[PDB]
Amino acid sequence: PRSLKKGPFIDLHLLKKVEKAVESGDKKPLRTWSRRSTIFPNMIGLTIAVHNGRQHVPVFVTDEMVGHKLGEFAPTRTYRGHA
Amino acid sequence: ARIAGINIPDHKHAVIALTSIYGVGKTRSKAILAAAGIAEDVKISELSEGQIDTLRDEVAKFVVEGDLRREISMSIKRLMDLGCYRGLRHRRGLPVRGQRTKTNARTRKGPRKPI
Amino acid sequence: AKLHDYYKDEVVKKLMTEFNYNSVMQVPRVEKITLNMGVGEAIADKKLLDNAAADLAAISGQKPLITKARKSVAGFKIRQGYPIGCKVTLRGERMWEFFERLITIAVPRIRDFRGLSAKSFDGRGNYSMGVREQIIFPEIDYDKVDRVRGLDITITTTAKSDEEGRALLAAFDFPFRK
Amino acid sequence: MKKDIHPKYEEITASCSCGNVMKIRSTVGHDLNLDVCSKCHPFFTGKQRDVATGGRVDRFNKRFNIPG
RNA sequence: CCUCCUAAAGAGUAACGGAGGAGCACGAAGGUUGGCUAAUCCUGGUCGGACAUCAGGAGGUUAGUGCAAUGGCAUAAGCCA
RNA sequence: AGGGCUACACACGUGCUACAAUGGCGCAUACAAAGAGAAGCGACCUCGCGAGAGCAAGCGGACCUCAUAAAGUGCGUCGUAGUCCGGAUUGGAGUCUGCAACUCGACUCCAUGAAGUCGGAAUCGCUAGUAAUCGUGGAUCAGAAUGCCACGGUGAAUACGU
Ligand SMILES: [Mg+2]
Ligand SMILES: [Mg+2]
Ligand SMILES: [Mg+2]
Ligand SMILES: [Mg+2]
Ligand SMILES: [Mg+2]
Ligand SMILES: [Mg+2]
Ligand SMILES: [Mg+2]
Ligand SMILES: [Mg+2]
Ligand SMILES: [Zn+2]
Numbered sequence A: 001p002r003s004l005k006k007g008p009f010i011d012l013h014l015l016k017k018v019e020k021a022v023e024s025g026d027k028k029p030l031r032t033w034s035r036r037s038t039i040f041p042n043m044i045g046l047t048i049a050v051h052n053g054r055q056h057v058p059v060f061v062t063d064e065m066v067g068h069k070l071g072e073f074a075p076t077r078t079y080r081g082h083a
Numbered sequence B: 001a002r003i004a005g006i007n008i009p010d011h012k013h014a015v016i017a018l019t020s021i022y023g024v025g026k027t028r029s030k031a032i033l034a035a036a037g038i039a040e041d042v043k044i045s046e047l048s049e050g051q052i053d054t055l056r057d058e059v060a061k062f063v064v065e066g067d068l069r070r071e072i073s074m075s076i077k078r079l080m081d082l083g084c085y086r087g088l089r090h091r092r093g094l095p096v097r098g099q100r101t102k103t104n105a106r107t108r109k110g111p112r113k114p115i
Numbered sequence C: 001a002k003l004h005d006y007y008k009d010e011v012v013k014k015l016m017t018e019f020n021y022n023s024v025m026q027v028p029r030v031e032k033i034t035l036n037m038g039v040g041e042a043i044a045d046k047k048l049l050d051n052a053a054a055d056l057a058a059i060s061g062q063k064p065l066i067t068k069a070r071k072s073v074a075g076f077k078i079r080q081g082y083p084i085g086c087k088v089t090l091r092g093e094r095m096w097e098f099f100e101r102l103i104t105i106a107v108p109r110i111r112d113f114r115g116l117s118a119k120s121f122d123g124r125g126n127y128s129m130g131v132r133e134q135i136i137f138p139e140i141d142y143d144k145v146d147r148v149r150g151l152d153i154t155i156t157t158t159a160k161s162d163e164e165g166r167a168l169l170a171a172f173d174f175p176f177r178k
Numbered sequence D: 001m002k003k004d005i006h007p008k009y010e011e012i013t014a015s016c017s018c019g020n021v022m023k024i025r026s027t028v029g030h031d032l033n034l035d036v037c038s039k040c041h042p043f044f045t046g047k048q049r050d051v052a053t054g055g056r057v058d059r060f061n062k063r064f065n066i067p068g
Numbered sequence E: 001c002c003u004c005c006u007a008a009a010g011a012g013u014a015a016c017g018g019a020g021g022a023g024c025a026c027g028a029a030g031g032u033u034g035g036c037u038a039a040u041c042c043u044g045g046u047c048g049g050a051c052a053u054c055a056g057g058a059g060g061u062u063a064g065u066g067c068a069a070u071g072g073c074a075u076a077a078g079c080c081a
Numbered sequence F: 001a002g003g004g005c006u007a008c009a010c011a012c013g014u015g016c017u018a019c020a021a022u023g024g025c026g027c028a029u030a031c032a033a034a035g036a037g038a039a040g041c042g043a044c045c046u047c048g049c050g051a052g053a054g055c056a057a058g059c060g061g062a063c064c065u066c067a068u069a070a071a072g073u074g075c076g077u078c079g080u081a082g083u084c085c086g087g088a089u090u091g092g093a094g095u096c097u098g099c100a101a102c103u104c105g106a107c108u109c110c111a112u113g114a115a116g117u118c119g120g121a122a123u124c125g126c127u128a129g130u131a132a133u134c135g136u137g138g139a140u141c142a143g144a145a146u147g148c149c150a151c152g153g154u155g156a157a158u159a160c161g162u
Helices: A012-024 B014-019 B026-036 B049-059 B066-082 B085-092 C002-019 C046-059 C093-109 C162-170 D056-064
Strands: A030-032 A047-051 A056-060 C030-038 C065-068 C083-089 C127-131 C151-157 D010-015 D021-026
Touching (some): B026 B049, C002 C093, C002 C162, C046 C151, C093 D021, C151 C162
Antiparallel strands (some): C030 C083, C065 C083, C127 C151, D010 D021
16 A cells, blocks of 8 residues: 555546535535545545546445445456356 | 463473463463573473563553453444445355455365265 | 342332332243253264263252254154154242352353343243353363354243343343443 | 252352353353353443444545635 | 934934944053153254254144044043153 | 456466475574676664665775575473464555556565365476575566576485386
């Protein structure tokens, strides 16, 4: 994981777009490609449509997701068994 | 000897005898023995009940045995109920930390299942 | 003994003063304590039935009744009259002394003890719990144990209701999950 | 109670690590030094508590201390 | 040879009429004295599960009778010493 | 830009680590050879259990650094047990590099402690400083070797014969 001396990582476009959303009370899904951004406690209550490769999976943010990247809740590979 | 909730092997030396606790390995046992002031080479059967009592009393600050099993289950259950990538790997029994599954996932996947 | 005198001194008055009983002996009392080992694999080996009987004789103060099968069952490959159980009812001073020994020694000797279930009643004030291992009792040592072995304890009381039986065992400080 | 059928029931002394000295009859046959009692267990004393199962926001703020 | 029906409320009553069993078992599965009451279901309870054993309840003979069927059987003819 | 090449009921090749006592571990201690280095190798000192961080000397190098080699030896312990063997997997806490370590990095700590007790038919390498094993360095490279290339230490057995 990333060092604690360098802080957590969040993409600016998302950080500014979720500050705008939490400032204006936006309930539309936050459309993003930034799967590398750590979830901050100001996304709590919003749904983030995180990319996974071919569509934006919407993930509603709860208290337990804080400190996880956005991409952990968007599975990229599809697998439904072999036989 | 009965430290925590389980039985410690009496015939062995303290360090290994204490490592028989879910939550105490070799260096945590060494730290327990060094804070108790007992040699690690002495057998547990050859030391007094007051030494047993203080060994229990400073094992007790380490979350161990069933409390540790509760904490580990709760962390894995939190991952699985949360439904992240680590949660889905724990749910499907696949390796969680990025190992290969084309070959050599045998510990996580159990024995071989022929088609 | 200590708990019959405890019972007769404070548990009777405590229950009276909350349940508003009109009579003195409307208070619940415990009637018997029954210990059961359902061995099962005695048909494979009669000697481990004797081992479980010696275990129950050490755990209680009494020799156990070797209990046979009531009717013939195919799924466990038993016939009627095949001995598959051990039963002791204590029922008196040895009941009170075992209740002390249980409540004081054996229940805090349970590995990972988060509490006994308060929903483990039959609906008529009688309690049943399951001891997972006979080592929780200090009558048997760790050395000469052939195999691990649990048992079943039922407290059969006088009480007519769930709330009475729950209220009575708490008067003796029973470890309910609460 | 029958006579030559039952195990020997003698009075012995049970002593805890907390200094709980106690007189109980049993079939042990010797005095014993038990290690947990009913005045000693964390459930009996109420010291068990629970696991955390939360505080991810507090863990975040403690490990980071970030402005904004 | 035994049991039920046919068989018409005493007995008996035929057909290549309708249904089933017997050619034994037990020195206890006999005698007696003392005692006891079943099936099934529910609710709890270590392994233990649909079903082993324990505890309580509902139930009231729906069980049991060495073996078919019928008639009996709680004073038990059933179960134990 | 994000994902994939890293998937996973399975099958095979090539490795690595083992199943231990000719060893595991703990303390002390002896002996290398080759090579690399300036958007680099980075001492000494301080801090950290550690990965590592801060300060910072020297070095475009027979100078300085990577970099006190390991097996070995000596003392002790373990006593044949799935173990003080083994180290897979997993949880928590971290470090570094890089815009960025979720997919999908290496490493550290604490806990976890999986299979495995020498491997069926079959099959491979090797004739001497060889096989076996024990460390070390390089290229590629921000980071990312159990691979490859190279380097020493210990060091056999066996070949009647076609
Ligand atoms: Mg007639
Ligand atoms: Mg007539
Ligand atoms: Mg008869
Ligand atoms: Mg691209
Ligand atoms: Mg040695
Ligand atoms: Mg090891
Ligand atoms: Mg050079
Ligand atoms: Mg095995
Ligand atoms: Zn105590």
